[PDB]
Design an enzyme around this catalytic site. Sequence first.
Site, PDB file in Angstrom:
ATOM      1  N   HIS A 160       0.644  -1.178  -0.054  1.00 52.33           N
ATOM      2  CA  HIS A 160      -0.084   0.029  -0.125  1.00 52.33           C
ATOM      3  C   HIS A 160       0.769   1.219   0.027  1.00 52.33           C
ATOM      4  O   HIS A 160       0.228   2.410  -0.262  1.00 52.33           O
ATOM      5  CB  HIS A 160      -1.148   0.031   1.205  1.00 52.33           C
ATOM      6  CG  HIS A 160      -0.425   0.427   2.520  1.00 52.33           C
ATOM      7  ND1 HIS A 160       0.055  -0.468   3.526  1.00 52.33           N
ATOM      8  CD2 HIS A 160       0.006   1.729   2.948  1.00 52.33           C
ATOM      9  CE1 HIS A 160       0.191   0.076   4.546  1.00 52.33           C
ATOM     10  NE2 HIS A 160       0.182   1.296   4.381  1.00 52.33           N
ATOM     11  N   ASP A 182      -0.094  -7.550   1.465  1.00 51.69           N
ATOM     12  CA  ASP A 182       0.241  -6.194   1.554  1.00 51.69           C
ATOM     13  C   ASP A 182       1.810  -5.771   1.717  1.00 51.69           C
ATOM     14  O   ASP A 182       2.289  -5.286   2.469  1.00 51.69           O
ATOM     15  CB  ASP A 182      -0.227  -5.357   2.935  1.00 51.69           C
ATOM     16  CG  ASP A 182      -0.091  -3.793   2.590  1.00 51.69           C
ATOM     17  OD1 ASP A 182       0.122  -3.237   1.633  1.00 51.69           O
ATOM     18  OD2 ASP A 182      -0.413  -3.139   3.531  1.00 51.69           O
ATOM     19  N   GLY A 230       3.048   6.379   8.450  1.00 53.80           N
ATOM     20  CA  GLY A 230       3.899   6.750   8.085  1.00 53.80           C
ATOM     21  C   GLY A 230       5.197   5.652   8.416  1.00 53.80           C
ATOM     22  O   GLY A 230       6.489   5.527   7.991  1.00 53.80           O
ATOM     23  N   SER A 264       4.375   2.092   8.476  1.00 53.07           N
ATOM     24  CA  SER A 264       4.286   1.034   7.719  1.00 53.07           C
ATOM     25  C   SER A 264       5.547   0.505   7.225  1.00 53.07           C
ATOM     26  O   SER A 264       6.202   1.309   6.738  1.00 53.07           O
ATOM     27  CB  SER A 264       3.128   0.833   6.926  1.00 53.07           C
ATOM     28  OG  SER A 264       3.512   1.654   5.568  1.00 53.07           O
TER      29      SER A 264
HETATM   30  C1  LIG Z   1      -3.455  -1.156  -2.251  1.00 55.41           C
HETATM   31  O1  LIG Z   1      -3.298  -2.376  -2.254  1.00 55.41           O
HETATM   32  C2  LIG Z   1      -3.405  -2.917  -0.919  1.00 55.41           C
HETATM   33  C3  LIG Z   1      -3.191  -4.279  -0.520  1.00 55.41           C
HETATM   34  C4  LIG Z   1      -3.234  -4.965   0.886  1.00 55.41           C
HETATM   35  C5  LIG Z   1      -3.511  -3.905   1.922  1.00 55.41           C
HETATM   36  N1  LIG Z   1      -3.723  -4.074   3.535  1.00 55.41           N
HETATM   37  C6  LIG Z   1      -3.962  -3.177   4.487  1.00 55.41           C
HETATM   38  C7  LIG Z   1      -4.165  -3.838   5.976  1.00 55.41           C
HETATM   39  C8  LIG Z   1      -4.202  -1.864   3.880  1.00 55.41           C
HETATM   40  O2  LIG Z   1      -4.401  -0.949   4.954  1.00 55.41           O
HETATM   41  C9  LIG Z   1      -4.454   0.487   4.654  1.00 55.41           C
HETATM   42  C10 LIG Z   1      -3.169   1.010   4.579  1.00 55.41           C
HETATM   43  C11 LIG Z   1      -2.922   0.837   6.271  1.00 55.41           C
HETATM   44  C12 LIG Z   1      -2.013   1.746   6.941  1.00 55.41           C
HETATM   45  O3  LIG Z   1      -2.438   2.896   7.127  1.00 55.41           O
HETATM   46  N2  LIG Z   1      -0.758   1.093   7.545  1.00 55.41           N
HETATM   47  C13 LIG Z   1      -0.120   2.348   8.491  1.00 55.41           C
HETATM   48  C14 LIG Z   1       0.641   3.339   7.712  1.00 55.41           C
HETATM   49  O4  LIG Z   1       1.622   4.081   8.747  1.00 55.41           O
HETATM   50  N3  LIG Z   1       0.614   3.624   6.313  1.00 55.41           N
HETATM   51  S1  LIG Z   1       1.811   4.831   5.702  1.00 55.41           S
HETATM   52  O5  LIG Z   1       3.003   4.642   5.944  1.00 55.41           O
HETATM   53  O6  LIG Z   1       1.344   6.017   6.479  1.00 55.41           O
HETATM   54  C15 LIG Z   1       1.208   4.934   4.103  1.00 55.41           C
HETATM   55  C16 LIG Z   1      -0.278   5.182   3.592  1.00 55.41           C
HETATM   56  C17 LIG Z   1       2.444   5.765   3.281  1.00 55.41           C
HETATM   57  C18 LIG Z   1       2.103   3.967   3.101  1.00 55.41           C
HETATM   58  C19 LIG Z   1       0.662   1.779   9.708  1.00 55.41           C
HETATM   59  C20 LIG Z   1      -0.565   2.606   9.991  1.00 55.41           C
HETATM   60  C21 LIG Z   1      -0.366   3.746  10.950  1.00 55.41           C
HETATM   61  C22 LIG Z   1      -1.368   4.667  11.170  1.00 55.41           C
HETATM   62  C23 LIG Z   1      -2.971   4.125  10.435  1.00 55.41           C
HETATM   63  C24 LIG Z   1      -3.912   5.422  10.472  1.00 55.41           C
HETATM   64  C25 LIG Z   1      -5.049   5.247   9.641  1.00 55.41           C
HETATM   65  C26 LIG Z   1      -5.369   3.886   8.678  1.00 55.41           C
HETATM   66  C27 LIG Z   1      -5.739   2.685   9.731  1.00 55.41           C
HETATM   67  C28 LIG Z   1      -5.612   1.455   8.995  1.00 55.41           C
HETATM   68  N4  LIG Z   1      -6.021   0.318   9.803  1.00 55.41           N
HETATM   69  C29 LIG Z   1      -6.456  -0.943   9.282  1.00 55.41           C
HETATM   70  O7  LIG Z   1      -6.818  -1.101   8.173  1.00 55.41           O
HETATM   71  O8  LIG Z   1      -6.705  -1.938  10.153  1.00 55.41           O
HETATM   72  C30 LIG Z   1      -7.517  -3.251   9.588  1.00 55.41           C
HETATM   73  C31 LIG Z   1      -6.745  -4.001   9.189  1.00 55.41           C
HETATM   74  C32 LIG Z   1      -5.962  -4.815  10.276  1.00 55.41           C
HETATM   75  C33 LIG Z   1      -6.517  -4.538  11.104  1.00 55.41           C
HETATM   76  C34 LIG Z   1      -8.051  -3.923  10.946  1.00 55.41           C
HETATM   77  C35 LIG Z   1      -4.441   1.114   8.406  1.00 55.41           C
HETATM   78  O9  LIG Z   1      -3.611   0.898   8.973  1.00 55.41           O
HETATM   79  N5  LIG Z   1      -3.980   1.043   6.796  1.00 55.41           N
HETATM   80  C36 LIG Z   1      -5.280   1.282   6.035  1.00 55.41           C
HETATM   81  N6  LIG Z   1      -4.068  -1.577   2.815  1.00 55.41           N
HETATM   82  C37 LIG Z   1      -3.972  -2.502   1.680  1.00 55.41           C
HETATM   83  C38 LIG Z   1      -3.710  -1.743   0.207  1.00 55.41           C
END
Ligand SMILES: COc1ccc2nc(C)c(O[C@@H]3C[C@H]4C(=O)N[C@]5(C(=O)NS(=O)(=O)C6(C)CC6)C[C@H]5/C=C\CCCCC[C@H](NC(=O)OC5CCCC5)C(=O)N4C3)nc2c1
Length: 197
Positions: A75, A99, A155, A157
């Site tokens: 992601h 992911d 930020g 992940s």
């Molecule tokens: C497009 O193809 C795909 C394929 C597989 C995929 N698989 C997942 C799980 C997925 O999730 C998306 C992205 C991920 C995320 O935000 N990751 C963090 C981060 O920091 N990203 S990031 O670096 O800022 C950035 C965006 C720059 C890269 C660590 C988080 C820190 C704060 C989050 C705050 C708000 C978001 C809460 C949300 N919560 C949640 O979804 O929880 C449910 C899932 C498991 C438990 C229930 C969450 O965490 N995410 C939503 N997108 C996918 C997309």
Amino acid sequence: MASMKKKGSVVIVGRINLSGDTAYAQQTRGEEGCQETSQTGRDKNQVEGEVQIVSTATQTFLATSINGVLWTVYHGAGTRTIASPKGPVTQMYTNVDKDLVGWQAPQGSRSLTPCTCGSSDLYLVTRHADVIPVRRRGDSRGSLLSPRPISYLKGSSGGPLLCPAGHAVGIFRAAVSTRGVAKAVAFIPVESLETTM
Ligand SMILES: COc1ccc2nc(C)c(O[C@@H]3C[C@H]4C(=O)N[C@]5(C(=O)NS(=O)(=O)C6(C)CC6)C[C@H]5/C=C\CCCCC[C@H](NC(=O)OC5CCCC5)C(=O)N4C3)nc2c1
Ligand SMILES: [Zn+2]
């Protein structure tokens, strides 16, 4: 067709220093040099350490070397190449269902060792060099011992969860929040990486 644009490369813009007694973030490239490096895919900078801070044109997150592979989240990186001294490097692992993506680890990187301790006392390393205690609660979940707003995890992940001995247990994937407070995290277990390999 004539105007078809191509997405840029992921660029290493810094690292989390875990060398010594104190963990701290270092920036190794500013935004403008990151912009040009994303376009050319040519990154001459020296790479060091296990946890890199990476950026595209529109996102920034982390990437973690484990057994010679730089791992991060799909992601964040999508299918993008990563910049390297001799040009864009194509991903050697891609799994949207996990992911997960991976490239060969950069020259000069250091790799974490996969954990075989079986321990549930973990530590999450963030992009701000916070080391957050996390209790493992399942194959891919852990609870924060001290919850905090999701803003503090945004930020990060692609960062590692570590065991007490500093082995890699998993790659931070998502935050489980209630009323904007992160109580738990989801991660890609290192075993799932080792299977992908
Ligand atoms: C497009 O193809 C795909 C394929 C597989 C995929 N698989 C997942 C799980 C997925 O999730 C998306 C992205 C991920 C995320 O935000 N990751 C963090 C981060 O920091 N990203 S990031 O670096 O800022 C950035 C965006 C720059 C890269 C660590 C988080 C820190 C704060 C989050 C705050 C708000 C978001 C809460 C949300 N919560 C949640 O979804 O929880 C449910 C899932 C498991 C438990 C229930 C969450 O965490 N995410 C939503 N997108 C996918 C997309
Ligand atoms: Zn261990």
